């Protein structure tokens, strides 16, 4: 909304024309997301400690290092607020994709907040029953996918982009809804899965958001889209602001959510970011790039399901713990080591995904 | 009178593994009490006791999956001497308590070194199928303090 | 009905198979996904590692200049 | 000499001033740069901070069914 | 080697013609540098254990967890060898700039190697005498600067790029040699200074290497250079390869140098990377981008200088420790917290520097 | 044989402040025996002792920079009282030891509070220039006990 005010004031002062450039809007959105996240961090942590534990106990080691008791499990509200404010400020409110991603973010954040509030405030070990959580996630994903399909019927907005073959560009019908459901729900769950360690979830998310920002910039321009043989989507331009806001919020949260994390992020934050990445991939028609760049998340899910299948079929488990990062931790690897090694893997995956984008 | 949730089962029992090793017994002359419907009783045994009458005699086979789960090596962890307290010598077989986030977990020494120790948290009843000869001596309602515990 | 080719069908099937493990997490309950025994082992490892830190020791007054 | 501009001299001086601290460190002996007492203080602070009061207590009970 | 080999082998198989493309060369440089670093890591670290301590050691249990004990120094040799191998394999050897970077990198690596050998093998705690160390640094830096000045003058090769003014591009004469000396030696010392924390130095170097890779790609193309209003340098194009190799080597070392580092960088690695960054910021005329993007190193050096100045002027000390990161560590911040927060700051500074390059 | 590196020297030292206040001393009947030439003695004393002979005597004043260095405020830190388990009570002047990465270092209690104590690692000889009267009792070759200490 702030961009419209700058455009209105352009008539009175030519200096406000800077506020309309894409690069300026993106950089300022990143900066404001980071600053708002940092500003809300210390106040949110203290307030959440009172809600979570009543007493605002000093966060210090070694308890905050190994057991991590006294650190508010509930979190990511700062991430959600920062992203929403940055997008609503430095992104055009009339762009359908901005609201298309914001609605998914807010819905997933609300479901995660219900779950975390039930688990922590009410001390219910069950928390929010998984049935209702997944039902709401599925209905939201199906609604957004149906809206996009209605807005993309007989349009390149329903095509699938093969990462290595430009000639393979099939046009999906109602199966577009199935693909959107699959990608959104799977990414949300996978990001939820990788919450077991400090800062292990906010990255890959930062690098993934940066890569999708670059792709959206490529997708948002006819010349670049034709050069890279990527589908041209007019409304995808504003998604760059959303991705930069995601990067800023992720950096601001990693300022606090890193070993020894002061505040975690439960279903809130993690599910919101997963849904945001899924809807961004759906909008950009780059689900394959989500799978490649987001290799860590899919690997986490594959490890969990492989462990479950090993338990079901054979008497010997494959991994020591269902998530691969927990499996490494139980093997003796310290938490920061696994966290930043997964960060390295994520950065390599993002670079490889951009390379493949360039191959076609 | 029959077993029901929130009622206390006074139990006389004999515990044997599939190999025939007698773990322990509670005779009718010295029964023992436990809640019903809370999982303190072995899960398989808790389901077996469901709805049985006072004085009923029955034999039930409880598998490893139904009692404490299967044995896992992940719960066997090395630990130095400095952790232990209040013991002159960390002789093998000694048992200590660790207050974990998931509640108390018994810790027993399986191997010992002059300055290093190896402990196992797995229950001795875990990882082996069990059979119980069981008689419900009496039934009563649980007290508020018992429910608190 | 969509427009498909055998190679395109195979690619779509491969993509759906690769994304399937992420989606199948829905049907697995928390108890089976996160075994209680393994979680207890994690907690015990964390608490023992916290306890395994290098503690202090009392010292006497003897010194060398 | 170089074909300087009156305005660019200020920028060049600013660049040299910003780069000076890195170069000026070459004349600071390691004794003042990093006293051994400082290393010991660092290590003692790290050791003291991570000290844990958790201890494994003995027990004896007959609660097993 | 490989580039010329593939260029010759094209006449046998046309598939090798792809190897000439810059993107493929950069990507394979990244991958090969990372793979070499990872492959040499575990075996190289074991060799240093015996050399530095006389016995191969491991934690072997809860004891010495998050402990720096039993971790060799002089780990930068792996970085040096990986970077050199990647550059020689995938960088056009005919490019003079690549050879200048290699020469300065190897010289600083040798200086650091002799210093660390004095410190460890001979137990000379003071290490190499500062006089001779800085004499060799100055000799190599001045030789490279003088060679560059003779090879290029009265052309954009010696012009200064003001970070925000396009018209103000003074043509430096012999002052170019002085500026190159200052920047190279300052970067080397600052990156050497950053070794206070194990994982602090490498990641900012990786981010700066990526930024300089982007700048070199912009600098190596006529159209891009004209669009961004930056000097055109024909040989600057190949610097993308060396920057990508630096990124790969840094990530590979951080795989093992993560807190608790299995091996310290030492003077080797750190000093060589500082020299490489300085020579890259000299060859590319964007020294101000080195100042801004590498703001962490400049801030650390300024903090040390301010600490000594305050300790001289008065009996008080501005900081708990002369380096700022140690100051925060003594304040209560755990080492990984400072590590990751400084990484966040470095990434933000790199993005800001790219923004300044854009807005000119 | 003159005093040199790797030679054990029997020293009857006496330490005083610039004001003449006694800090520590040793008589000729019980001199300090340790290996010379490794920065073990205060560097000023080690430097001064070089070249002297059995039965030689001298007096020297040594600055802070050459003996235990200057005082460092970072070596004094707040610590909760719960850290010091194994002892009934704490009082100012009590001393403890810390096994520490990059060399163990001792600490002395400087203050006591309701829930916290303040301990300082600075040696009492640090931060002060000191005067050292010395008498050389005997000189001998290396011995392993001095290396063990």
mmCIF file of C-alpha atoms in Angstrom, chain A residues 28-273:
data_model
loop_
_atom_site.group_PDB
_atom_site.id
_atom_site.type_symbol
_atom_site.label_atom_id
_atom_site.label_comp_id
_atom_site.label_asym_id
_atom_site.label_seq_id
_atom_site.Cartn_x
_atom_site.Cartn_y
_atom_site.Cartn_z
ATOM 1 C CA UNK A 28 13.715 -2.109 0.978
ATOM 2 C CA UNK A 29 11.299 -4.998 1.561
ATOM 3 C CA UNK A 30 14.208 -7.222 2.591
ATOM 4 C CA UNK A 31 15.602 -4.528 4.888
ATOM 5 C CA UNK A 32 12.256 -3.713 6.512
ATOM 6 C CA UNK A 33 11.457 -7.397 7.043
ATOM 7 C CA UNK A 34 14.833 -7.903 8.719
ATOM 8 C CA UNK A 35 14.485 -4.795 10.889
ATOM 9 C CA UNK A 36 10.909 -5.519 11.983
ATOM 10 C CA UNK A 37 11.839 -9.126 12.777
ATOM 11 C CA UNK A 38 14.796 -8.012 14.896
ATOM 12 C CA UNK A 39 12.741 -5.331 16.658
ATOM 13 C CA UNK A 40 9.902 -7.742 17.473
ATOM 14 C CA UNK A 41 12.301 -10.527 18.482
ATOM 15 C CA UNK A 42 13.346 -9.508 21.997
ATOM 16 C CA UNK A 43 9.857 -8.323 22.957
ATOM 17 C CA UNK A 44 8.147 -11.411 21.527
ATOM 18 C CA UNK A 45 10.579 -13.788 23.249
ATOM 19 C CA UNK A 46 10.021 -12.217 26.668
ATOM 20 C CA UNK A 47 6.241 -12.118 26.217
ATOM 21 C CA UNK A 48 6.122 -15.711 24.962
ATOM 22 C CA UNK A 49 8.240 -16.844 27.919
ATOM 23 C CA UNK A 50 5.611 -15.426 30.275
ATOM 24 C CA UNK A 51 2.859 -17.179 28.314
ATOM 25 C CA UNK A 52 4.828 -20.422 27.990
ATOM 26 C CA UNK A 53 6.318 -20.567 31.500
ATOM 27 C CA UNK A 54 4.762 -17.713 33.493
ATOM 28 C CA UNK A 55 8.145 -16.616 34.809
ATOM 29 C CA UNK A 56 10.517 -14.812 32.431
ATOM 30 C CA UNK A 57 13.495 -17.001 33.279
ATOM 31 C CA UNK A 58 16.924 -15.966 32.027
ATOM 32 C CA UNK A 59 17.905 -17.915 28.911
ATOM 33 C CA UNK A 60 21.416 -19.214 29.591
ATOM 34 C CA UNK A 61 23.411 -22.393 29.168
ATOM 35 C CA UNK A 62 23.966 -25.214 29.529
ATOM 36 C CA UNK A 63 20.213 -25.773 29.945
ATOM 37 C CA UNK A 64 19.425 -23.649 26.882
ATOM 38 C CA UNK A 65 22.048 -25.625 24.919
ATOM 39 C CA UNK A 66 21.252 -29.324 25.413
ATOM 40 C CA UNK A 67 17.812 -29.637 27.022
ATOM 41 C CA UNK A 68 16.616 -26.230 25.758
ATOM 42 C CA UNK A 69 14.051 -26.033 28.556
ATOM 43 C CA UNK A 70 12.759 -22.535 29.223
ATOM 44 C CA UNK A 71 13.005 -21.509 25.559
ATOM 45 C CA UNK A 72 9.516 -20.736 24.155
ATOM 46 C CA UNK A 73 8.623 -23.551 21.765
ATOM 47 C CA UNK A 74 5.906 -21.389 20.216
ATOM 48 C CA UNK A 75 7.308 -19.057 17.587
ATOM 49 C CA UNK A 76 7.223 -17.876 14.013
ATOM 50 C CA UNK A 77 4.564 -15.263 14.768
ATOM 51 C CA UNK A 78 7.316 -12.691 14.268
ATOM 52 C CA UNK A 79 8.142 -14.304 10.913
ATOM 53 C CA UNK A 80 4.501 -14.166 9.830
ATOM 54 C CA UNK A 81 4.004 -10.561 10.942
ATOM 55 C CA UNK A 82 7.234 -9.405 9.293
ATOM 56 C CA UNK A 83 6.410 -11.102 5.989
ATOM 57 C CA UNK A 84 2.812 -9.859 5.963
ATOM 58 C CA UNK A 85 3.761 -6.274 6.815
ATOM 59 C CA UNK A 86 6.619 -6.146 4.304
ATOM 60 C CA UNK A 87 4.469 -7.548 1.491
ATOM 61 C CA UNK A 88 1.485 -5.319 2.285
ATOM 62 C CA UNK A 89 3.798 -2.292 2.346
ATOM 63 C CA UNK A 90 6.213 -2.745 -0.562
ATOM 64 C CA UNK A 91 4.104 -4.968 -2.856
ATOM 65 C CA UNK A 92 1.179 -3.856 -4.990
ATOM 66 C CA UNK A 93 -2.071 -4.833 -3.207
ATOM 67 C CA UNK A 94 -3.938 -5.312 -6.507
ATOM 68 C CA UNK A 95 -1.696 -8.169 -7.681
ATOM 69 C CA UNK A 96 -3.638 -11.465 -7.425
ATOM 70 C CA UNK A 97 -0.518 -13.502 -6.613
ATOM 71 C CA UNK A 98 0.336 -11.353 -3.580
ATOM 72 C CA UNK A 99 -2.982 -12.218 -1.949
ATOM 73 C CA UNK A 100 -2.765 -15.766 -3.311
ATOM 74 C CA UNK A 101 0.412 -16.339 -1.295
ATOM 75 C CA UNK A 102 -0.583 -14.221 1.718
ATOM 76 C CA UNK A 103 -3.814 -16.173 2.238
ATOM 77 C CA UNK A 104 -1.924 -19.481 2.288
ATOM 78 C CA UNK A 105 0.664 -18.017 4.661
ATOM 79 C CA UNK A 106 -1.985 -16.710 7.060
ATOM 80 C CA UNK A 107 -4.066 -19.890 6.983
ATOM 81 C CA UNK A 108 -1.121 -22.180 7.653
ATOM 82 C CA UNK A 109 0.055 -19.812 10.375
ATOM 83 C CA UNK A 110 -3.380 -19.908 11.997
ATOM 84 C CA UNK A 111 -3.495 -23.717 11.973
ATOM 85 C CA UNK A 112 0.016 -23.888 13.403
ATOM 86 C CA UNK A 113 -0.876 -21.298 16.033
ATOM 87 C CA UNK A 114 -3.902 -23.331 17.107
ATOM 88 C CA UNK A 115 -1.712 -26.429 17.385
ATOM 89 C CA UNK A 116 1.057 -24.665 19.317
ATOM 90 C CA UNK A 117 -1.369 -22.892 21.658
ATOM 91 C CA UNK A 118 -3.099 -26.184 22.445
ATOM 92 C CA UNK A 119 0.224 -27.952 23.046
ATOM 93 C CA UNK A 120 1.916 -25.246 25.137
ATOM 94 C CA UNK A 121 -0.679 -22.997 26.772
ATOM 95 C CA UNK A 122 -3.151 -25.814 27.452
ATOM 96 C CA UNK A 123 -0.387 -28.399 28.069
ATOM 97 C CA UNK A 124 -2.269 -30.933 25.923
ATOM 98 C CA UNK A 125 0.267 -33.461 24.647
ATOM 99 C CA UNK A 126 -2.078 -34.251 21.751
ATOM 100 C CA UNK A 127 -2.257 -30.621 20.668
ATOM 101 C CA UNK A 128 -4.383 -29.954 17.616
ATOM 102 C CA UNK A 129 -5.676 -33.259 16.268
ATOM 103 C CA UNK A 130 -3.850 -34.036 13.036
ATOM 104 C CA UNK A 131 -7.127 -34.822 11.260
ATOM 105 C CA UNK A 132 -8.440 -31.251 11.499
ATOM 106 C CA UNK A 133 -5.014 -29.750 10.769
ATOM 107 C CA UNK A 134 -4.575 -31.685 7.530
ATOM 108 C CA UNK A 135 -8.235 -31.187 6.589
ATOM 109 C CA UNK A 136 -7.842 -27.411 6.832
ATOM 110 C CA UNK A 137 -4.518 -27.489 4.984
ATOM 111 C CA UNK A 138 -6.062 -29.586 2.210
ATOM 112 C CA UNK A 139 -9.150 -27.395 1.850
ATOM 113 C CA UNK A 140 -7.060 -24.205 1.723
ATOM 114 C CA UNK A 141 -4.683 -25.719 -0.836
ATOM 115 C CA UNK A 142 -7.552 -27.014 -2.975
ATOM 116 C CA UNK A 143 -9.304 -23.645 -2.864
ATOM 117 C CA UNK A 144 -6.224 -21.707 -3.936
ATOM 118 C CA UNK A 145 -5.423 -24.280 -6.632
ATOM 119 C CA UNK A 146 -8.986 -24.114 -7.970
ATOM 120 C CA UNK A 147 -8.863 -20.312 -8.041
ATOM 121 C CA UNK A 148 -5.572 -20.394 -9.951
ATOM 122 C CA UNK A 149 -6.895 -23.017 -12.378
ATOM 123 C CA UNK A 150 -9.991 -20.912 -13.053
ATOM 124 C CA UNK A 151 -7.631 -17.977 -13.622
ATOM 125 C CA UNK A 152 -5.357 -20.128 -15.805
ATOM 126 C CA UNK A 153 -7.681 -22.325 -17.857
ATOM 127 C CA UNK A 154 -6.363 -22.723 -21.414
ATOM 128 C CA UNK A 155 -3.421 -20.553 -20.350
ATOM 129 C CA UNK A 156 0.331 -21.177 -19.944
ATOM 130 C CA UNK A 157 -0.315 -20.773 -16.193
ATOM 131 C CA UNK A 158 -1.283 -24.482 -16.111
ATOM 132 C CA UNK A 159 1.774 -25.892 -17.907
ATOM 133 C CA UNK A 160 4.541 -27.980 -16.338
ATOM 134 C CA UNK A 161 8.190 -26.992 -16.807
ATOM 135 C CA UNK A 162 10.612 -29.897 -17.224
ATOM 136 C CA UNK A 163 13.998 -28.805 -15.783
ATOM 137 C CA UNK A 164 16.063 -30.257 -18.661
ATOM 138 C CA UNK A 165 13.750 -30.305 -21.721
ATOM 139 C CA UNK A 166 12.090 -27.195 -23.142
ATOM 140 C CA UNK A 167 10.045 -29.211 -25.652
ATOM 141 C CA UNK A 168 8.272 -31.162 -22.872
ATOM 142 C CA UNK A 169 5.669 -28.565 -21.848
ATOM 143 C CA UNK A 170 2.412 -30.433 -21.197
ATOM 144 C CA UNK A 171 -0.691 -28.457 -20.249
ATOM 145 C CA UNK A 172 -2.397 -29.786 -17.127
ATOM 146 C CA UNK A 173 -6.165 -29.728 -16.744
ATOM 147 C CA UNK A 174 -7.821 -30.576 -13.439
ATOM 148 C CA UNK A 175 -4.598 -32.443 -12.618
ATOM 149 C CA UNK A 176 -3.176 -28.982 -11.910
ATOM 150 C CA UNK A 177 -5.258 -29.063 -8.723
ATOM 151 C CA UNK A 178 -3.749 -32.439 -7.820
ATOM 152 C CA UNK A 179 -0.214 -31.162 -8.412
ATOM 153 C CA UNK A 180 -0.827 -28.010 -6.364
ATOM 154 C CA UNK A 181 -2.292 -30.049 -3.505
ATOM 155 C CA UNK A 182 0.622 -32.491 -3.567
ATOM 156 C CA UNK A 183 3.345 -29.846 -3.690
ATOM 157 C CA UNK A 184 1.820 -27.487 -1.118
ATOM 158 C CA UNK A 185 0.939 -30.136 1.466
ATOM 159 C CA UNK A 186 4.170 -32.085 1.012
ATOM 160 C CA UNK A 187 6.338 -28.984 1.315
ATOM 161 C CA UNK A 188 4.432 -27.836 4.393
ATOM 162 C CA UNK A 189 4.827 -31.203 6.094
ATOM 163 C CA UNK A 190 8.503 -31.472 5.132
ATOM 164 C CA UNK A 191 9.294 -28.011 6.504
ATOM 165 C CA UNK A 192 7.389 -29.044 9.626
ATOM 166 C CA UNK A 193 9.469 -32.234 9.811
ATOM 167 C CA UNK A 194 12.823 -30.411 9.767
ATOM 168 C CA UNK A 195 11.953 -28.245 12.805
ATOM 169 C CA UNK A 196 13.802 -30.596 15.174
ATOM 170 C CA UNK A 197 16.981 -28.485 15.279
ATOM 171 C CA UNK A 198 17.737 -24.801 15.722
ATOM 172 C CA UNK A 199 17.884 -22.881 12.460
ATOM 173 C CA UNK A 200 17.671 -26.082 10.411
ATOM 174 C CA UNK A 201 14.311 -25.041 8.908
ATOM 175 C CA UNK A 202 14.722 -21.293 8.315
ATOM 176 C CA UNK A 203 17.494 -22.470 5.996
ATOM 177 C CA UNK A 204 17.140 -23.951 3.276
ATOM 178 C CA UNK A 205 14.133 -21.586 3.370
ATOM 179 C CA UNK A 206 16.270 -18.445 2.949
ATOM 180 C CA UNK A 207 18.245 -19.769 -0.028
ATOM 181 C CA UNK A 208 15.105 -21.291 -1.547
ATOM 182 C CA UNK A 209 13.322 -17.940 -1.260
ATOM 183 C CA UNK A 210 16.262 -16.178 -2.899
ATOM 184 C CA UNK A 211 16.308 -18.645 -5.776
ATOM 185 C CA UNK A 212 12.566 -18.318 -6.304
ATOM 186 C CA UNK A 213 12.973 -14.530 -6.204
ATOM 187 C CA UNK A 214 15.489 -14.787 -9.039
ATOM 188 C CA UNK A 215 13.185 -17.120 -10.985
ATOM 189 C CA UNK A 216 10.190 -14.819 -10.470
ATOM 190 C CA UNK A 217 12.265 -11.896 -11.725
ATOM 191 C CA UNK A 218 13.071 -14.023 -14.772
ATOM 192 C CA UNK A 219 9.429 -15.106 -15.060
ATOM 193 C CA UNK A 220 8.058 -11.585 -14.579
ATOM 194 C CA UNK A 221 9.705 -10.205 -17.735
ATOM 195 C CA UNK A 222 8.840 -11.242 -21.283
ATOM 196 C CA UNK A 223 12.430 -10.955 -22.518
ATOM 197 C CA UNK A 224 13.971 -13.039 -19.729
ATOM 198 C CA UNK A 225 11.123 -15.562 -19.816
ATOM 199 C CA UNK A 226 11.589 -16.103 -23.554
ATOM 200 C CA UNK A 227 15.380 -16.245 -23.199
ATOM 201 C CA UNK A 228 15.209 -18.926 -20.489
ATOM 202 C CA UNK A 229 12.197 -20.678 -22.084
ATOM 203 C CA UNK A 230 10.241 -20.257 -18.840
ATOM 204 C CA UNK A 231 6.488 -19.509 -18.971
ATOM 205 C CA UNK A 232 5.705 -15.795 -18.889
ATOM 206 C CA UNK A 233 3.344 -14.816 -16.061
ATOM 207 C CA UNK A 234 2.516 -11.120 -15.830
ATOM 208 C CA UNK A 235 1.512 -11.176 -12.154
ATOM 209 C CA UNK A 236 4.613 -13.141 -11.083
ATOM 210 C CA UNK A 237 6.629 -9.913 -10.874
ATOM 211 C CA UNK A 238 5.297 -9.014 -7.428
ATOM 212 C CA UNK A 239 6.357 -12.437 -6.119
ATOM 213 C CA UNK A 240 9.928 -11.101 -6.028
ATOM 214 C CA UNK A 241 8.887 -8.784 -3.191
ATOM 215 C CA UNK A 242 7.295 -11.698 -1.323
ATOM 216 C CA UNK A 243 10.419 -13.839 -1.705
ATOM 217 C CA UNK A 244 12.696 -11.011 -0.555
ATOM 218 C CA UNK A 245 10.439 -10.440 2.459
ATOM 219 C CA UNK A 246 10.703 -14.162 3.209
ATOM 220 C CA UNK A 247 14.501 -13.912 3.035
ATOM 221 C CA UNK A 248 14.505 -10.917 5.368
ATOM 222 C CA UNK A 249 12.197 -12.580 7.883
ATOM 223 C CA UNK A 250 14.268 -15.758 7.753
ATOM 224 C CA UNK A 251 17.489 -13.879 8.462
ATOM 225 C CA UNK A 252 15.819 -11.949 11.277
ATOM 226 C CA UNK A 253 14.554 -15.163 12.853
ATOM 227 C CA UNK A 254 17.895 -16.941 12.415
ATOM 228 C CA UNK A 255 19.272 -14.010 14.399
ATOM 229 C CA UNK A 256 17.432 -15.659 17.314
ATOM 230 C CA UNK A 257 16.606 -19.217 16.159
ATOM 231 C CA UNK A 258 20.110 -20.641 16.024
ATOM 232 C CA UNK A 259 21.926 -23.049 18.310
ATOM 233 C CA UNK A 260 21.414 -22.358 21.201
ATOM 234 C CA UNK A 261 18.093 -20.990 19.923
ATOM 235 C CA UNK A 262 16.347 -18.506 22.191
ATOM 236 C CA UNK A 263 12.933 -19.224 20.631
ATOM 237 C CA UNK A 264 11.897 -22.094 18.366
ATOM 238 C CA UNK A 265 9.181 -22.113 15.723
ATOM 239 C CA UNK A 266 6.589 -24.861 16.034
ATOM 240 C CA UNK A 267 3.898 -25.444 13.438
ATOM 241 C CA UNK A 268 3.711 -21.658 13.227
ATOM 242 C CA UNK A 269 6.444 -20.333 10.975
ATOM 243 C CA UNK A 270 7.457 -23.736 9.623
ATOM 244 C CA UNK A 271 4.087 -24.580 8.067
ATOM 245 C CA UNK A 272 3.642 -20.993 6.882
ATOM 246 C CA UNK A 273 7.015 -21.023 5.111
#
